[PDB]
Amino acid sequence: MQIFVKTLTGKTITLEVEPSDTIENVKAKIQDKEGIPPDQQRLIFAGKQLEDGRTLSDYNIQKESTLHLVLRLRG
Amino acid sequence: LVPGLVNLGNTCFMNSLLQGLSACPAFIRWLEEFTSLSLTLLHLLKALSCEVLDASCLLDVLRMYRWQISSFEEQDAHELFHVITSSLEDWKSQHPFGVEFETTMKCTESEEEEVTKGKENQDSLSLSIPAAPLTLDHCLHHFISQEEITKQSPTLQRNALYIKSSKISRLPQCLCIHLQRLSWSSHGTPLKRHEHVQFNEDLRLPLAGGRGQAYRLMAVVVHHGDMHSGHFVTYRRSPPSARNPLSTSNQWLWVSDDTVRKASLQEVLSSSAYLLFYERV
């Protein structure tokens, strides 16, 4: 299925994924398109930050759902 | 005029966020009704809304159950914000910061195809800062404006170009704007965005038919430094006077962990905003 990711500039990219894909798999696909290492990505769906080790289906992420990508600014 | 918060182990990301949340009285009222982590949070925000306090118990509970971090590393105040809001949920009644959008997708390549409608739920608006006068109003306008999206077309049976448009469908009593200050460089590296983004005390979210909702600024979390190391401070309103308890103070404070100082509005507006907290007028 396709899901959408709003990237750092606001441009929305489209990923090819399965409900069984892990968050790590999804970040790898984002890395393929945007160049951002997975350990630097914060992915948010419906306000919840997605955790490695879970799957899209764990979050009820369905066909044509939209994720938001932001980086981690530490202090 | 308010207690400071001690920095035990790089906790300014928490202290700055708590200072800003404690300046949002509608959020405190929501929490009081919700509690009629929430109580640990509520007790801190009550103290900070009227000496130095310690917020480490909140971090202990978060580390136990919600967020696997150590006790002493630097962290992102925005990531802590979403840990807090998502911990309160575990939609309208559980999301005092929640904005809803109704979205529409229209195929540019197939005029006969029926548009599809969608919903997006957000507890902060993570705006992008364009290449460099940079204004929050423009970043917000761009965030809500139409955009191009590629997706499979049922009518064309291939990927096609779609336009997504958005309308705000739910207005929260409390609003968090997040100015993304990390971008990706042309060299494939992270880049801190230091540029001033102009913002006002008053913000209007547009709605259908010219309707809109006014919001009033309560606090600004500011990041100093780079992504290798930095520091968070907060500019916030003072608490109102006891004789005008539901009013909004026009006195501002600068709060950096255990230090509280009076600040002019001009100093607030001149700061490098990272998180802006508003309440619905």
Author numbering:
A (entry chain B): 1 to 75
B (entry chain A): 66 to 101, 116 to 129, 136 to 175, 218 to 259, 263 to 301, 318 to 361, 437 to 502
What does the paper say about this structure?
The mitochondrial deubiquitinase ubiquitin-specific protease (USP) 30 negatively regulates PINK1–parkin-driven mitophagy. Consequently, the mitochondrial deubiquitinase (DUB) ubiquitin-specific protease (USP)30 has emerged as a critical negative regulator of mitochondrial quality control due to its ability to remove ubiquitin from a subset of mitochondrial outer membrane proteins. By grafting structural elements of well-crystallizable human USP family members onto the periphery of the human USP30 protein, we generated stabilized and crystallizable protein constructs that retain DUB activity and the propensity to compound inhibition. In an iterative process, we explored 15 chimeric constructs starting with boundary design by structure superposition, design validation by AlphaFold2-based modeling, cloning, protein purification and biophysical characterization. This process is illustrated with four diverse chimeras: chimera 1 (USP30ch1) features the fingers of USP7, chimera 2 (USP30ch2) features the fingers of USP14, chimera 3 (USP30ch3) features the fingers of USP14 and the box 4–5 insertion of USP35, and chimera 4 (USP30ch4) features the fingers of CYLD.
Upon surveying the collected data, we decided to focus on USP30ch3. This construct containing the USP14 fingers and the USP35 box 4–5 insertion features unaltered catalytic activity, displays an increased protein stability by approximately 4 °C and reacts readily with Ub-PA. To validate our design, we solved the crystal structure of the covalent USP30ch3~Ub-PA complex. Both a rather high rate of initial crystal hits in coarse-screening plates and the high resolution of 1.5 Å without crystallization fine screening supported the hypothesis of increased crystallizability of this chimeric protein. Inspection of the electron density revealed that the boundary design allowed seamless chimeric sequence transitions and did not perturb the USP fold. Chimeras 1–3 showed complete binding to the ubiquitin probe Ub-PA, which correlated with protein stabilization, whereas this was not the case for constructs with truncated fingers. To understand how binding to NK036 inhibits USP30, we compared our structure to the USP30~Ub-PA complex. The superposition also revealed large and surprising conformational changes of the switching loop that allow the N-tert-butyl-benzenesulfonamide group to bind deeply within the thumb subdomain.
